[PDB]
Nucleic acid binder design. Structure first.
Lengths: 88, 224, 129
RNA sequence: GGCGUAAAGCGCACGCAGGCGGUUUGUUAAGUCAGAUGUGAAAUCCCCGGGCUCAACCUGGGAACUGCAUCUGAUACUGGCAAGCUUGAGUCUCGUAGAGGGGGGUAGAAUUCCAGGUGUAGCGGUGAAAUGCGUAGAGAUCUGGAGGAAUACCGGUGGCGAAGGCGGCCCCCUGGACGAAGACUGACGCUCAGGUGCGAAAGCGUGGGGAGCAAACAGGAUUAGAUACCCUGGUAGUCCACGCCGUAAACGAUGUCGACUUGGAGGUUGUGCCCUUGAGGCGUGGCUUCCGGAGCUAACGCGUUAAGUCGACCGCCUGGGGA
């Protein structure tokens, strides 16, 4: 998974505090970082279905978090999807 | 009945924690060295109520049937039931002594006829082969039905030791509506009994204490 | 997941009655407290208390008569998958009147005969016989 | 009304539409409820009478027409809206166990083959035989080499994985689960038609590889026959890379999620406490095996890992054949 330092950096830049590790923005950012990191692994290991299942779990969890955020506050949703480079 | 005498007699002791019956949870005080300890504060009032009901049954022209067949409580049950003009089953309980009384009545008649023709009759037509045969049949029939030969009918109350060991007698008494007074240990089933007396039923001094108390109360009931 | 807490309360009561439990505890709620009030005033449970402030815990004291269950039957009628509403002229009577039917009328949660005397209908919460 | 065995749980999972949804406050009055108004043609149905000499029949009045719309109120529940809350659901910290997956390397035992030494008449196989190999030197034994496949002991109603499945050792990449104490977000949840993905073995396509085993095939037996079982060989295949296939008694013949309900003995993996006496005792989680209580079941049996008591959603069944 992500190292401790990368996780701390993401939590700091996406959270309202250094301890706000549960915010929707922090969770979506961590999931996006893990997906982007896994992208390179699966480019080389196209036959790793067992890990791709966890990758798809991460993708679906990020999708549900983004849906909840868009339904809750669309402004933060837009800021997040522009800061992370989403929307296909 | 005295909780000091009870605790000195070994009543509070129970079986190991594995063999316990969860229905005996209200009467269990705790555990020490993986054996259950019966709550004597629960034991003494239930024993007193059972003794009161036994005294009522005795004073109201009743017949008590003392049931216990373990090698620990056989002779004790015999002594207790003979000490108060009562009846006992201190050896194997024949399946159907109560529910099938119309059939064991014939065996009682046979035992009585054999013992009368042996003692008072004194046939002396021995043949030295049918005589020993008849004496062995008489001794078997007496070891089986020696306690209830003078009962006449069904009793009015059963006093059972080791309610788990004597489940057949309890089920028969329940089928016939006879109240059951049973010493229910931590491993026995207290469902089929009317007056459950939670106490140790394996130690000899505990069962002698129970039987002495019951004999005293039924004698005071007999003498009104 | 937990999608019907009222049926959960009824099931807890039924299972505690079948297991000869002295009292049953559960997470509290306004509707649960109203139904427990209706059950206590009708004589199906002994008492009930709500403990806790941030996470209230409702505790019902079950009732027995002859070593037997006082609540013989308790069923959820209106449920999330199928809501049941009745008018005052078609309010149900359980056990031909010996049982009660907890009804949620616009004047609070009450029994079926109380809602009938009040000239009201509403959602049939449960049947208690 | 059902789906363990009688017909019936998709092989497994992700997930859009849909269905359902913890808890508090306020507001609305859409569902819901109450009242009123309008309407609900007549006949028919039903009730009390009347006339046909009775009946059928005719007929007066009533009830009914369980419905729809409108208007006025109620606010408990469901819904909408707004603000919350932490117990459901997730994130972070530190660790733990594991044949979880993908890639590369390597080790030993054994089979087969090639070359050579010793050595001589058998070997192999079977119920018994024969086919087969062998005086061109087999089998046995010893030495060296080649190649492929699978990993003895550990090893275990043991472990991991959604399922299918996963077993030498090492390294690289990587998923999930669990536990301790906290912090964080604040219903973000459950299920899921269609959809997508994974999916034993066999099989197919292309390119390799090929020791052992072995469909087809050949021969020897057995037999009345023997297109078989048995024996001697043996091609595809089994192995690798990449695609396809999408099926299994894909089984727990038992869909997923959540709550509640007496116990006993174990296994495995964390964690806490105590002169730690000890490989100790006492708690507390996760997964797991056997027995068994109430209950349930046609019975067998299931039984806190339910086939018990419930809730949400989905799939499926409607006599046996045809099929």
């Amino acid at each position: 998974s992500l190292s401790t330092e990368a996780t701390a950096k993401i939590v700091s830049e996406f959270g309202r505090d250094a301890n706000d590790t549960g915010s929707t923005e922090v969770q979506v950012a961590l999931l996006t970082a893990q997906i982007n990191h896994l992208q390179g692994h699966f480019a080389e290991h196209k036959k790793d279905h067992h890990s791709r299942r966890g990758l798809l779990r991460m993708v679906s969890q990020r999708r549900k978090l983004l849906d909840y955020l868009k339904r809750k506050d669309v402004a933060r949703y837009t800021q997040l999807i522009e800061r992370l480079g989403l929307r296909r | 009945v005295s909780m000091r005498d009870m605790l000195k007699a070994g009543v509070h002791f129970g079986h190991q924690t594995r063999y316990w019956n969860p229905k005996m949870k209200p009467f269990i005080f705790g555990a020490r060295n993986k054996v259950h300890i019966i709550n004597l504060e629960k034991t003494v009032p239930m024993f007193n109520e059972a003794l009161a009901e036994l005294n009522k049954i005795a004073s109201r022209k009743g017949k008590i049937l003392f049931v216990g067949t373990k090698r620990a409580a056989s002779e004790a049950v015999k002594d207790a039931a003979l000490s108060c003009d009562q009846f006992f089953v201190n050896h194997r309980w024949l399946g159907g002594m109560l529910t099938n009384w119309k059939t064991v009545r014939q065996s009682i008649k046979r035992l009585k006829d054999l013992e009368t023709q042996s003692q008072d009759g004194t046939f002396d037509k021995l043949t030295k082969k049918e005589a020993l045969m008849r004496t062995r049949e008489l001794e078997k029939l007496e070891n089986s039905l020696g306690g209830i030969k003078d009962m006449g009918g069904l009793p009015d109350a059963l006093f059972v030791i080791d309610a788990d060991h004597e489940h057949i007698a309890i089920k028969e008494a329940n089928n016939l509506g006879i109240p059951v007074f049973a010493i229910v240990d931590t491993n026995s089933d207290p469902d089929g009994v009317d007056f459950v007396i939670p106490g140790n039923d394996d130690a000899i001094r505990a069962v002698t204490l129970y039987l002495g108390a019951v004999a005293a109360t039924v004698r005071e009931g007999r003498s009104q | 997941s937990m999608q019907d807490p009222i049926a959960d309360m009824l099931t807890r009561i039924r299972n505690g009655q079948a297991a000869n439990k002295a009292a049953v505890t559960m997470p509290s709620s306004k509707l649960k407290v109203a139904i427990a009030n209706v059950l206590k005033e009708e004589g199906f449970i002994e008492d009930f208390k709500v403990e806790g402030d941030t996470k209230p815990e409702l505790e019902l004291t079950l009732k027995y008569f002859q070593g037997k269950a006082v609540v013989e039957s308790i069923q959820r009628v209106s449920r999330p998958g199928l809501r049941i509403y009745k008018r005052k002229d078609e309010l149900p009577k359980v056990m031909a009147g010996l049982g009660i039917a907890v009804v949620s009328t616009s004047k609070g949660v009450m029994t079926d005969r109380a809602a009938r005397q009040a000239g009201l209908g509403g959602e049939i919460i449960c049947y208690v016989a």
